[PDB]
Every structure is written in structure tokens, then in C-alpha cells.
Symmetry: C6
């Protein structure tokens, strides 16, 4: 049920490599659900940068 790349995209958001645009591209591609993208974006951007 959880997307295979959830951890991958969460980590990219945490290190500030992924932008809001790239999270939307992932949702469009079906690599994340909108709910997962929203969950990831609730974390602080680049907190592990």
C-alpha cells in the first residue's frame, strides 16, 4: 500500500534536493500518491541539508 519510493522522496525533501514541483511530478508519474506527497511536505524542507 505505501509507495516504493516514499522513503526516497522523503529523504530528497529532507535534504532540500527535492522541490514542491518535483513532488507534484512524482504524484503525476504515480510514484507517490497525493496523500504521500502531502505527508512528505509536512516535514521541514532541507532540515537535513
Amino acid at each position: 500500500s505505501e509507495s516504493l519510493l516514499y522513503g526516497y522522496f522523503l529523504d530528497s525533501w529532507l535534504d532540500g534536493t527535492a522541490s514542491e514541483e518535483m513532488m507534484r511530478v512524482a504524484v503525476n508519474a504515480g510514484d507517490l500518491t497525493q496523500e504521500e506527497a502531502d505527508k512528505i511536505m509536512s516535514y521541514p524542507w532541507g532540515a537535513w541539508n
Copy 2:
């Protein structure tokens, strides 16, 4: 059985990148249970350094 990101968050607690505030964000997102966050926080913060 344990959350997929348990090891991921334990490692960031041990390396001193994750704070208690980050642990709260992870629990709120549903990426850790409160019990797992409490377990992680029983380890010495920044021990690896």
C-alpha cells in the same frame, strides 16, 4: 513489523541530525509510532559523533 523508516530515523538521532521536534513531525505524519519515537529517544542523541 516495525515502521519502514524506523532505522532511517534511529540513524539520524544517533548522528545528531534529528531533534525531538523532527521525531514529533515523523509521529504526526505516521512514519513512526509514538512508541518507536520513544524507543529512538532512549538512545543517546548524537552518540555516533
Copy 3:
């Protein structure tokens, strides 16, 4: 389900290491389906940089 190297090739595209010619080689090798190569290339190349 998904090809084992989907994440591996997506990451290489995102970090700008993989080119469209490399994606063709991966499809030819059978390590990606054409659908997965098309999905990866829809992401914007090099976006991690």
C-alpha cells in the same frame, strides 16, 4: 510489479548522470520497461542539481 532498478535509474536521471541514450540501453537490456523509461524521462532531467 515495478522493475527492481526503477529507483536506481530514476535517481540517475534526476541527478543528471543518465542521458536519454542510457535510458534506451536500459530498456534494450530489459532492466526497464519502455513505460518506466517514459515515466522517468517525464521527470525533469538533472532536477537534483
Copy 4:
């Protein structure tokens, strides 16, 4: 075998983990005492 066996073995081999840390891991339930003793049978910091 505990999920973090490999993770703690690696930390012992690169010399980041101490015996005190291995005890904290066992107390947390992330390693069994048997696994902690197995890890400690390896040379500490060998990877260096």
C-alpha cells in the same frame, strides 16, 4: 535475526559503536544479547 543487526555490526566494525552503545541497543530491544555478543566477537574498528 533483528532488522538492525547489520546496522550495528557495521557501526562496531568502523569503530563508531562502543560496548555502552551495544547495551543501549539491547535494552531498546533492537538487538538481542546473543546478537550484541556476536557483534562484539568481531574486532572493534577493524574497518579502519
Copy 5:
């Protein structure tokens, strides 16, 4: 199904660390099938060196 170290050896070929010498060792050891070694070698050797 797929050998566990397929991705590992493909990455070593792309980064130029592996040559057919390594591919032969892995096949002999049973860490790769000949078909997988052949698939890996169809990629450009050392393409991801940098």
C-alpha cells in the same frame, strides 16, 4: 528470478570498476547467471565513471 547482486554488479560495470574478469568470477561463484553478465556487458563500460 533475478540475482540479488545484479544491481550491484551493473553499477560496478557502469562505474568502470568491473571488467569481464569480474563478470567471470561472479558467474563462476553463482552471484550472477551468464545471461545477467551478458545483459550487464551490453551497457557501456565506465559510462558513469564521473
Copy 6:
């Protein structure tokens, strides 16, 4: 089909970090079988250099 740490020890042998001694300690601990240790040692040590 094989020990969980097979790949981990093979990579350490190929990286040149692991020695023959280390491989025998892994067999002793039961983290590698003697067959796996022998298989790993058939590879060129430190090849990734």
C-alpha cells in the same frame, strides 16, 4: 537462499576493507557460511580500487 550479510562482506572484500581474518570471524559468528567466505575470497581483493 544465502546469508543476509553476503553482499555486505563481498563489498568489503572488493573495497579492500576486509581481510581473510575478518572473513573467518564472520564464519565463526555464523554471519557467513564457510562456502560463502570461500566464494568471497575467490574475488580479487580490493578490486574496487
